[PDB]
Every structure is written in C-alpha cells, then in structure tokens.
C-alpha cells in the first residue's frame, strides 16, 4: 500500500496505487483507494480495508449533513477533528491509517492520522506498507514553491518507488489534483505500467467436454399471470 501526499504552492495532490492484497495472495489488481469525503476533501487509506472504507462513509454523512446545516462549504479541519474524536473513542481497535487532504476557503491543508487518535501536519506525508520507500524519494526531490506540473511528477515517481521495492504495491497509479479556487480533477489510471504480457496460447475448451449429471431450469420470476 503506498499513499503519498504532496503540497504545492496553490494546492495539494494525493496519489496511490491500486493493488489490494489480503495475505500473500493478491485480492484485486485494481481498486481505487481514493475516496471522496466531500467534493473538495479526498482521503485515501491504508491499514485494514474494511475499517477505513466504513469510517470514511460515516464521517462523510455527518459532514454532508453538517455542510447543508451551516450552508457553507465544509472546512478541512472539521472532518479531521471528527475523525480524531471517533477513533479515540474505541482505544484504537479501528485500524484506520488515513491521509485526509483538501482545500477549502481558508487554504490548503494536509494531515495524517494514526489509529489511536494522533494527528500531524506536514508538507509531504506518506502512509501504507511501502511508505518508507516513497518517503525516501520525497526527502530528496521535494523543495519549496512547486508548481502544479512538477509536483505531479514528484508524486508519480514516489508511487513508482513503492511499485518497485514494496511487494504490496503494484499495478496502476491513481492521482487526484486539488487546487485552490477550482474544481478538483480526478485522473484515474494516470500511470499504467506492467501491462500483462500475453499468454502463449488460448485455453478455450470444447463445448461438451465437462460431464454433467442432470439439468433444471429454475425460474426465479414472480408468479405469472395466465
């Protein structure tokens, strides 16, 4: 798992891989781990895949509830402060490891949050099981006052760092760009490496090859008129 987060001058870019592992066996080759709190606050997640996705859902509704009720854009801080409280109420069984990022009226923000309810800021953070690999590349190339077009190059290479040295990082590389004062842009499958080499031959079989015992047509349609 590798999710980096890089700030730049006008905004923030959050990037990830798509490989979802369960044990040594690779569950699903694609899976957007980018989720959407609100239209300008994304969060991606690391750790236990059930426990983010459930807790990203639940703090979504309440912020979506809360945003209508105060009739203004929702603010990054709020999502973060809510998470922080909900996780702390269970003594860290909810194995959440979330990067929450986002823009809003009051500026760019980028936070990290570990299962017990600890919270940090930074200008480039990373979580996941590759994170150490990603974290390296960042600590050299990253500098102040990046543009947009540069910073996405820094992000992809840091994921690519993941891909090559971490086993639980593979496949496609998603991105999502958020810049102050515009709509945010989702660029799914931004980098596709390691396309699957072709098979040596087809494996299609002959019709009738597997022996059957007997058949039925079991109609699930609701009771018919006659």
């Amino acid at each position: 798992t590798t999710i980096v987060g890089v700030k730049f001058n006008n905004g923030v870019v959050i990037a990830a891989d798509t490989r979802s592992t369960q044990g040594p066996i690779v569950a699903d080759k694609n899976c957007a781990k980018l989720h959407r709190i609100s239209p300008k606050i994304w969060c991606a997640g690391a750790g236990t895949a059930a426990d983010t996705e459930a807790v990203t859902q639940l703090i979504g509704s309440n912020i979506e509830l809360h945003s209508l009720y105060t009739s203004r854009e929702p603010r990054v801080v709020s999502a973060l402060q809510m998470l922080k409280q909900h996780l702390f109420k269970y003594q860290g069984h909810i194995g959440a490891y979330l990067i929450v990022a986002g823009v809003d009226p009051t500026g760019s923000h980028l936070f990290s949050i570990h299962a017990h309810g600890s919270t940090d800021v930074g200008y480039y953070l990373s979580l996941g099981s590759g994170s150490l690999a990603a974290m390296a590349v960042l600590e050299s190339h990253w500098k102040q006052d990046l543009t947009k077009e540069e910073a996405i190059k820094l992000a992809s290479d840091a994921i690519q760092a993941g891909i090559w040295n971490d086993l639980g990082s593979g496949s496609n590389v998603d991105v999502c760009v958020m810049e102050i004062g515009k709509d945010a842009e989702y660029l799914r499958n931004y980098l596709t490496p390691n396309v699957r080499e072709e098979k040596q031959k087809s494996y299609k079989f002959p019709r009738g090859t597997t022996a059957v015992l007997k058949e039925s047509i079991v109609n699930i349609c609701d009771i018919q008129e006659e």
């Binding site: 809360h66 009720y69 105060t70 009739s71 203004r72 603010r75 801080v77 709020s78 973060l80 402060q81 809510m82 409280q85």
Partner: peptide, 13 residues
Amino acid sequence: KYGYDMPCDVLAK
C-alpha cells in the same frame, strides 16, 4: 466538535 469558532449565523439558527 468542528474546531473553529462558531460563526454567528450558526449560533443564531
């Protein structure tokens, strides 16, 4: 609960 001073509008409502 949300970490910023309650804007006026919200308090009135």
